[PDB]
Point group: C2
Chain length 239, copies 2
């Protein structure tokens, strides 16, 4: 039922990415859209939902569009009061068919998934759940830290974003020019036996497409915060 671990050549090597690593760092360093108790107002294409989410701090947007895997997954959340959490982008972000290619977008932002039902998804006493992350550097458990969440069923996105944010500060996961690591993947292990992973490095080439990379969250995958296990496996550029 689950997805097997990555083989040597299934992973992206950072040395084969000749572009700016700061484009990857931008997506995980204190960067996220967070909304509370909202309902869908409109749709652009059949598989997406548009929301009226305003940026409090920077005020870079007042409307958010999130793409889902298909029409079915979108219509499931169309008229639901939900909470939103995910990594947004502006380059090649379209809300209408009259938008040209290369659009940088003004007060609107785009993202994938990051949707959870509001009703019945929070802890009884208004507490926060601690999720433990185990970090492996060259098959050696160097450090372990905890991220928090107010959700019982949380998207894999929220946990991954919070895990990378910490790693950028503590271990310099992503820097402007490059990365101290050659390969890296975040693996999720559910209490129902299901496992899956995400490639933490950008595809080979001199260009980085943010909207193409964030498609890994399109499926809106969720995990039980109390029982899920998370492992980050990294390998240094040296040895």
């Amino acid at each position: 039922e689950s997805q097997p671990d990555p083989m040597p050549d299934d992973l992206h090597k950072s040395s084969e990415f000749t572009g700016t690593m700061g484009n990857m760092k931008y997506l995980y360093d204190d960067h996220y859209v967070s909304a509370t108790k909202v309902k869908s107002v409109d749709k652009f294409l059949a598989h997406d939902l548009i929301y009226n989410i305003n940026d409090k701090k920077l005020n870079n947007y007042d409307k958010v569009k999130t793409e889902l895997l298909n029409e079915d997954l979108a219509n499931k959340y169309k008229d639901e009061v939900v909470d939103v959490y995910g990594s947004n982008y502006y380059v090649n972000c379209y809300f209408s068919s009259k938008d040209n290619v290369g659009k940088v977008t003004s007060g609107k932002t785009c993202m994938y998934g990051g949707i959870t039902k509001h009703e019945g998804n929070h802890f009884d006493n208004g507490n926060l759940q601690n999720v433990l992350i185990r970090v492996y550097e060259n098959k050696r458990n160097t450090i372990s830290f905890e991220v928090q969440t107010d959700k019982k069923s949380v998207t894999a996105q929220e946990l991954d974003i919070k895990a990378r944010n910490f790693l950028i500060n503590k271990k310099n996961l992503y820097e402007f020019n490059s990365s101290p690591y050659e390969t890296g993947y975040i693996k999720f292990i559910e209490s129902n036996g299901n496992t899956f992973w995400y490639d933490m490095m950008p595809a080979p080439g001199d260009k980085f497409d943010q909207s193409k990379y964030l498609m890994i969250y399109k499926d809106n995958k969720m995990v039980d915060s109390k029982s899920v296990k998370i492992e980050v496996h990294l390998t240094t550029k040296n040895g």
Copy 2:
């Protein structure tokens, strides 16, 4: 992330099962445990939960034990008000360490999974959701029918039980001595892209172990009733 379709030899052939097919038929023909708004009262082993569920019609039991994949999945539902639906058995059903091998059990019954949270899992107007089942006989769509459920997030077990029950009556899926079909599998396709299947035929040999066969529900797998697709693929013994 998902499970690939079965290869020719991944499936059980009914001609290689020299036992009584009525043992398989017994588990799906108007046979199921159904409970409403209950909470766990005790535990036998670390991965299971015992409930006070009484049989209304036949009164064959007043206590039910359901086994889950592990301690984590069990402790998740330990203090939750839940609804139960699944296929039960009595042969080799133990509730204590003082139970001998081959126990037929009196007023107690055993099952796997079949657990869903009660709060926030029912349709707004008190309606029932119709789930369409597509039947393929020798790669040919012969018939299509609908099963019903009062749950938004239903276990794969409840749907499979209801699908087989209909097929036993309409197509004689399982009979006492044998089966008109050589192979058969029920495939689930989720709106999140995940797919998985179950083998509908008993393992080769002259003996049928009901408790070993029902372990396919141990993981307590659930699907979104409104968007899930179900396909039953069968092959006749002839051609």
